[PDB]
Amino acid sequence: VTEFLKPRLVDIEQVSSTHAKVTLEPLERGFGHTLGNALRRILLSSMPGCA
């Protein structure tokens, strides 16, 4: 009952340079949005750095 479809990055089609395109499968009928939204909001601000 706690067994889901554990996913994986099937490919990293890094298009050209300083640009990647990472596809992940398979997720549940609703977990693509929650992982996309979690990673999108964290990368946007939380991720630190210098400028």
């Binding site: 979690a38 990673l39 964290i42 939380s46 991720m47």
Partner: peptide, 12 residues
């Protein structure tokens, strides 16, 4: 993913 996993080690 490391940041989000370190923000959940007080639950699991």
């Amino acid at each position: 993913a490391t940041i989000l996993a370190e923000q959940l080690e007080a639950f699991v």
